[PDB]
Symmetry: C3
Subunit: 334 residues, 3 copies
């Protein structure tokens, strides 16, 4: 049918790791879902040492916000590049078909805006990212990426096709940064992005990230900003990596149902300890918490997690179950 | 039955990314399929800068040609090492059972030939590569690898077991090269392969390729050599990496049906954005084009794609579908 | 029911690649299975050059021993840290639920012991490793890891749900070591673990292992210590990597049935040439040998296998099958 006859809904995006309100099961027919994002180039402190980079962001955050729609909705994105920015940007949705995922049609100079519409024909979680010709990896590895979830119209289903319903959803975007180092191993500093570019390229070509972080910085998902849940709650964690493979693991838990490559027409993998999300992919894992306390959620290359930054915490409330685990003899001398 | 009573068919191989003519559904009983390959050691220019390596090839190309047979055919390979070559070579088929995939039985010095036969008992796409004792990774990372497709006798089937038929097939071999660098970062030059060997080994041990290319060189699958299709065509892309993990992605499309690890008795993964092909594996992805224009097919570590070379193009002809994607407001000022 | 009313069985662990005796199909009701492990910090020679590291081990071996239980058994582990050790240790089971896999409850100083019990609620093969707060990757990458197999109570089943029974089982633990190098590229030497720590951290942060080995050393699974089988035997190989992705391959064979991410409620992948086990995961592959002779089992990044050490051998006895493979014309001149 004619697109103009469809309902329109405007969505206001929220900062990761939170996700905008939506229904898992579609309560309306197919809609045009309107999103707006404003590009912001900004300084960001990415580690405990105070290393500061020039980040390139969708809507002021690394990662960009999680958009949520249903299969066969239309996504209409208004992308704004304000005059206070210096670079050309665009957007490629892996969820979309044609024109380099939209990138060929969304090139915006500072001071310009554009509106793209596409039909979300395939259910799953998908990466989106900036991809300006000749400079793709630089923009992506400076923070300019996020994800979109296209839910099946009747929600998520298990390996047997029975309903799976989540109580909470979180979005973890994992970012590999490549801060240029001198011969001594110190991080170089640059006046302008153009003076940064070649050294940025040389650093990228090492294929060795200097930092690998969740939600834009070392420790971003810890402390007061730890993820939360209660014993018995069903949590969906959507995890994306636009450029580099990752291997999420919940320390003390499991992925009860996992779409490691993120596409909901496939049956989920059951009972995973660790799962592989290839670079350029988003995945989703569903877990029901069974024990309280602190959990760490990590990239299980443990160097990547505990030295380069790819670690966050869940604080879980509720009853301790001694049947599942107990200290029989607490640590003591002999 | 006695092998001598079977039909024999001789196949003449073609240069990747093209594939020799074959039937998807087997029109004959089990056959002996005869292939011939001639080893050629040659200089190859691998990048825009004119970096020239001593390549080791099957049949003059990187990758070697795609062989296609059906499940329970016999593959009879005549491998020729002419006297103009300097090194010992052999061949290991991952499709074969026994004798290190044939490698124990096919060692040929310059001036020698050998004929191996094996039964293709398992359907799938499989790597083949050179593997001379004591020097395996050097030969493999100098170009000496390809793939073989063993089709099910009744062709490919979807996740529900209905027929899937491809209209075109392409073979992308992805090659990681490790050109030795000095302390300054320049590529070293060597008189003979023996003088090259240790520096080749040290470069390999960095685990950081200097180049990652499709069809033997940066830009080999672009421009006049872009892959082609039309809107509505069903295309199979077979992709191999003998040594290093890769993560293919069609920018602007999907893998509608994907055998990421390449073995056809398993149901395909549906609707993939990006898929992981482990080093030492061949995979296959089937896509029906729905939009015209240029597509890029990339390793979605984007540094690997756009800086080290792992990117090619499809040029697709046909009708633009405004329902699937459209520019609502073209990029403009405010 | 009350745990005290269950049967108890004490198991005596064996050195990898061998596995303690067990039944595939559970011959008793749910039990408490008692294991004891003693931490041993020791010097280990890891390569042909005689490079010696200070290893941190469970029970004196790298990897630690494979524990085998059935789904819904209880695992009771007595962990002993003798006074001859210098460091704090603990244990995290990926098989367990809660308290960081047990790590929060098992911290033992030299001279102390502890007993943990957990319920093995999920069938599969799982990593266990040391994880002391603030120093996780160092302990894990110094050898302190192993695996546990939780069999389904009715044993393993194929993709159709018919029984699969193994005749032999082997455990290959793959270890990535990061020996610190100076500016010249020589391996540094250290008096105490505390003087080693920062250089250990800097080496880890390169993300480039210096050694990647099976069973604790280059060539540990070769020669007199080669794995063995006979033609016709069904062999299960359990393979773990606590920190880094690997891609096992049996040269001359296949993975007939593969749980690449190791969890037995999922159907196995069939006919794999090579499979990906993500860092932080254990996998399992079942193969029936069809040809005699020497096989190599390798990480199929071939640099990792043949230069850094991730290669072992099987010696297989029995009848040669000329139908599956034969030399038609043995290597000769022209
Ligand atoms: O943008 N990645 O967090
Ligand atoms: O040989 N690989 O393109
Ligand atoms: O501990 N890994 O062999
Ligand atoms: Cu941008
Ligand atoms: Cu992309
Ligand atoms: Cu060769
Ligand atoms: Cu191989
Ligand atoms: Cu320890
Ligand atoms: Cu762990």
């Amino acid at each position: 049918v004619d697109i103009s006859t469809l309902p329109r809904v405007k969505v206001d995006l929220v900062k990761p790791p939170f996700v905008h309100a939506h229904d898992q099961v579609a309560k309306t027919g197919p809609r045009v879902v309107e999103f707006t994002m404003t590009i912001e180039e900004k300084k960001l402190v990415i580690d405990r040492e105070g290393t500061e980079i020039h980040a390139m962001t969708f809507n002021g955050s690394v990662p960009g916000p999680l958009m949520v729609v249903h299969e066969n909705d239309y996504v209409e994105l208004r992308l704004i590049n304000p005059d206070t920015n210096t670079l050309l940007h665009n957007i490629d949705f892996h969820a979309a078909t044609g024109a380099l995922g939209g990138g060929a049609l969304t090139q915006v100079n500072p001071g310009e805006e554009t509106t793209l519409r596409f039909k979300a024909t395939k259910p799953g979680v998908f990466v989106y990212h900036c991809a300006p010709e000749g400079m793709v990896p630089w923009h992506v590895t400076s923070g300019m990426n996020g994800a979109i979830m296209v839910l099946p119209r009747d929600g998520l289903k298990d390996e047997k096709g029975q309903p799976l319903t989540y109580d909470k959803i979180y979005y973890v975007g994992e970012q590999d940064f490549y801060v240029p180092k001198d011969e001594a191993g110190n991080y170089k500093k640059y006046e302008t992005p153009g003076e940064a570019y070649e050294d940025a390229v040389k650093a990228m070509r090492t294929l060795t990230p200097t930092h690998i972080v969740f939600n834009g910085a070392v420790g971003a998902l810890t402390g007061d900003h730890a993820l939360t849940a209660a014993v018995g709650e069903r949590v969906l964690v959507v995890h994306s990596q636009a450029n580099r493979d990752t291997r999420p693991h919940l320390i003390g838990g499991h992925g009860d149902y996992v779409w490691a490559t993120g596409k909901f027409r496939n049956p989920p993998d059951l009972d995973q300890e660790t799962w592989l999300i290839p670079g350029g992919t988003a995945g989703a894992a569903f877990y029901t918490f069974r024990q309280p306390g602190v959990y760490a959620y990590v990239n299980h290359n443990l160097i990547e997690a505990f030295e380069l930054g790819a670690a966050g915490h869940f604080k879980v409330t509720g009853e301790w179950n001694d049947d599942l685990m107990t200290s029989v003899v607490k640590p003591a001398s002999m």
